[PDB]
Design a protein around this ligand. Structure first.
Ligand SMILES: [Ca+2]
Ligand SMILES: [Ca+2]
Ligand SMILES: [Ca+2]
Ligand SMILES: [Ca+2]
Ligand SMILES: [Ca+2]
Lengths: 423, 6
């Protein structure tokens, strides 16, 4: 379970004392937690231009320690909410907040929020490192690879206010080589990172379908809405129409369909009839058919929920003498075959898919740094621990070990920090 | 799932 305590002397981070005047719309913040008995109450969000945000002290993830001089450690959500609502308009509330506990991180990311976070100190330190004679890369890597992505957005903000220069511009000018690529990738938000990588994979008729496939096939609906949004903000065109430009045929069809990000959401009930029905349909459309009905495959694989499809592919083995991946490698070729194999891997076991892509990026002569870097950046706060345990199970040695063999210098150290562990 | 606007 996450960390709890009823005693303020045992809380870790830093303490904030604020006074809010109750407005006609309350104090302007929502609270989360406090149903499970030993659960902190944390600030989930703030109403822009509302009393809490206008005051400027409260932040998301802050733990509510006490209200009006009464400790509420271990209060239920219902007891606390009642305290706030009883305060009449124009009266004020005193809030003691503990900063340093996380809200809503993935239990499977390798990279965690830094608990003693001081954006200003890091900005100062990275500036001092950038301006060292012969740049201090160690400090830059040491700091940025051990901050969460949203703490990096804060560092970038503080750096810009301290120097009047964007952080990412200052680091592009101070860094070089693969280290530059890692650090610049780390500085983007996930949606910005994926958008720019999608853009770079479509930089012309020389399209890198491998990279377009990796991102489009592996990102969830939520992730894709955000990507479609900031891609149009960043590049003043819709992601869909750049895909239509640089792709064609059934491959374009399947890429357009996935990139929309309107896959069915996880149902509450398992639909055994439709599972068998889909499994039958996939077989009818391929192995037992002359040629292959590609539209039926696109339809089923892009529209059903991921847990439903996991059971479809199992149930498909009842009908086909070849499983879904082996059937794909017999029925299609080229970019379309590649995309299908990538998608089915992501549905069946997304961490194993990334582990195999990481293994492929390093196993031979040299390194496919582009793939190695994008995976370590994009998955580090998502499922890197599952990726590592899948990789170690299959290949015997850790992911850490393979990175050590394939990379060197500060680049290697940055990738091992993103990896996590000491091995 | 515990959320409420205060
Ligand atoms: Ca108190
Ligand atoms: Ca140097
Ligand atoms: Ca066939
Ligand atoms: Ca059977
Ligand atoms: Ca290789």
């Amino acid at each position: 379970k996450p960390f709890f305590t009823r005693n303020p002397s045992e809380l870790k981070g830093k303490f904030i004392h604020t006074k809010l005047r109750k407005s006609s719309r309350g104090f302007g913040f929502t609270v989360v937690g406090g149903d499970e008995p030993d659960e902190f109450l944390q600030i989930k969000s703030l109403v822009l231009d509302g009393p809490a945000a206008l005051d400027g002290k409260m932040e998301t993830g802050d733990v509510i320690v006490s209200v009006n001089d009464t400790c509420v450690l271990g209060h239920t959500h219902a007891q606390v909410v009642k305290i706030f609502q009883s305060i009449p308009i124009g009266a004020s509330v005193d809030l003691e907040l503990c900063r340093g506990y996380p809200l809503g991180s993935s239990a499977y990311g390798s990279v965690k929020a830094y608990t003693n976070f001081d954006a200003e100190r890091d900005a100062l330190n990275i500036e001092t490192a950038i301006k060292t004679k012969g740049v201090d890369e160690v400090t830059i890597v040491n700091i940025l690879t051990n901050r969460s992505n949203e703490q990096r957005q804060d560092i970038a903000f503080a750096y810009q206010r301290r120097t009047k220069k964007e952080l990412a511009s200052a680091l592009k000018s101070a860094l070089s080589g693969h280290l530059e690529t890692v650090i610049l990738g780390l500085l983007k938000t996930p949606a910005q990172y994926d958008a720019s990588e999608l853009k770079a994979s479509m930089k012309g008729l020389g399209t890198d379908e491998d990279s377009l496939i990796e991102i489009i096939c592996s990102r969830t609906n939520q992730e894709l809405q955000e990507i479609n949004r900031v891609y149009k903000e960043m590049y003043k065109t819709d992601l869909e129409k750049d895909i239509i430009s640089d792709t064609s045929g059934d491959f374009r069809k399947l890429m357009v369909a996935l990139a929309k990000g309107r896959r069915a959401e996880d149902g509450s009930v398992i639909d055994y009839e439709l599972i068998d029905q889909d499994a039958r349909d996939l077989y009818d459309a391929g192995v037992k058919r002359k040629g292959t009905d590609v539209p039926k495959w696109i339809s089923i694989m892009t529209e059903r929920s991921v847990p439903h499809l996991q059971k479809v592919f199992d149930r498909y083995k009842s009908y086909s003498p070849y499983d879904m991946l082996e059937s794909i490698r017999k029925e299609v070729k080229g970019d379309l075959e590649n995309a299908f194999l990538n998608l089915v891997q992501c549905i069946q076991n997304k961490p194993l898919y990334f582990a195999d892509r990481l293994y492929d990026s390093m196993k031979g002569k040299g390194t496919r740094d582009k793939v190695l870097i994008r995976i370590m950046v994009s998955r580090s706060e998502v499922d890197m621990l599952k990726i590592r345990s899948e990789f170690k199970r299959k290949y015997g040695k850790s992911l850490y070990y393979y990175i050590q063999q394939d990379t060197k210098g500060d680049y290697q150290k940055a990738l091992l920090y993103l990896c996590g562990g000491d091995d | 799932l515990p959320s409420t606007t205060l």
